[PDB]
Amino acid sequence: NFTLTQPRAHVDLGVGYTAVCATAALRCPLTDMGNTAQNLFFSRGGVPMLHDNVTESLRRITASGGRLNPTEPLPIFGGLRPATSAGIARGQASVC
Amino acid sequence: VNTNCNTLDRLLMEAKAVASQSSTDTEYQFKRPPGSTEMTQDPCGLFQ
Amino acid sequence: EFVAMPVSTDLQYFRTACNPRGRASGMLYMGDRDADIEAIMFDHTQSD
Amino acid sequence: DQLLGVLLEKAPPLSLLSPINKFQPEGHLNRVARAALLSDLKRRVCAD
Amino acid sequence: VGDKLVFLEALERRVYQATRVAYPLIGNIDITFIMPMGVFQANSMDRYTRHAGDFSTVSEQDPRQFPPQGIFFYNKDGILTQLTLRDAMGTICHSS
Amino acid sequence: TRHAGDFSTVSEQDPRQFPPQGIFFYNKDGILTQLTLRDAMGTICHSS
């Protein structure tokens, strides 16, 4: 498996500015500007509640509301990813 | 910024080719990976 | 043809292009090569 | 006659072929860009 | 252009065609959107109507002078979505 | 009033009737700023 490489170098030859860009047109938008509310329970926060049985109630209720919510059995490689859906329709979802 | 006392008009050199703050191929908006070379433009976070 | 449905379905689903099943289905939403089309059609634990 | 009959059932619609050729760079799209393309197609089927 | 003879080249056909390489001139852009949700106008003057009898309800009490609890806006595809209050449950009911 | 009901409140007493105290106008950037009566305090509440 051969490989070819070659070093190079450059430098801005101008005193002031020399080049300029600008946004000109608009192709398709990439993220649907919908209503995908966040969820804080993804975070291993600090001071927790006192009774573990009300934390579960809170999480259960708030996971009954949206579709972005962590999986229940905490995996071991990576962290608390959201449920992988079957199909995606309008594009990447924005996190309101 | 390191040059908070040196540069007078960094408005240009701070708002040209800022690197992405998130991912773009995930079914949600995730934090940026370590190895994404995407490069964007941000007029919003420039003036806050 | 007629399809029974509640009298509570909000009309903002009819003022534009829509789908009579009430659940948007079809191969074009496969997302990956491995997910089930039968999931996008009939599974009623995931969001439309 | 038969020549036209062969050319006919071989030609995809223009309304779907013209825009898909505006995404040719790396025509192996992620699961995201494909979705936005599909919505562009949904728009540019009806209005023209 | 103006008073300078310049070049005008598109490099999407000669180069960049038929390879797994994106064109560097089709860039991204990020824009931030904000919308106040649930605000109630603290006054008596400002809670008014344009004319007398606009959007009047046949019912006795006008359901519009109640403090609004949602917000409506337009999606990417141009469909009317909605952002209610219970979408803030995942953010205000966290233990933090 | 030019017409019947312009800016009709639902309360019992039309708050348009009380004598105004403030005054509204536009900033340098067309932003609706407000100048109220309790700001002349520097001038009218002096020993002079």
Side-chain angles (χ1 to χ4, degrees), chain C residues 7-22:
Chain C
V7 286
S8 308
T9 63
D10 176 277
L11 281 83
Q12 211 58 27
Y13 185 80
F14 294 93
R15 297 212 183 282
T16 82
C18 74
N19 179 22
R21 272 175 63 257

Side-chain angles (χ1 to χ4, degrees), chain E residues 56-76:
Chain E
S56 201
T57 309
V58 56
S59 306
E60 201 153 289
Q61 272 301 127
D62 211 355
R64 286 180 182 82
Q65 62 196 44
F66 308 152
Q69 305 204 5
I71 195 173
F72 291 95
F73 57 76
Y74 271 137
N75 195 341
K76 163 177 101 85

Side-chain angles (χ1 to χ4, degrees), chain F residues 6 21 32-33 42 47:
Chain F
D6 295 27
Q21 310 177 202
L32 172 53
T33 183
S47 78

Side-chain angles (χ1 to χ4, degrees), chain A residues 58-75:
Chain A
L58 283 195
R59 168 158 62 256
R60 175 143 45 90
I61 289 298
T62 179
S64 79
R67 62 189 187 89
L68 167 64
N69 45 4
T71 41
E72 177 78 54
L74 324 179

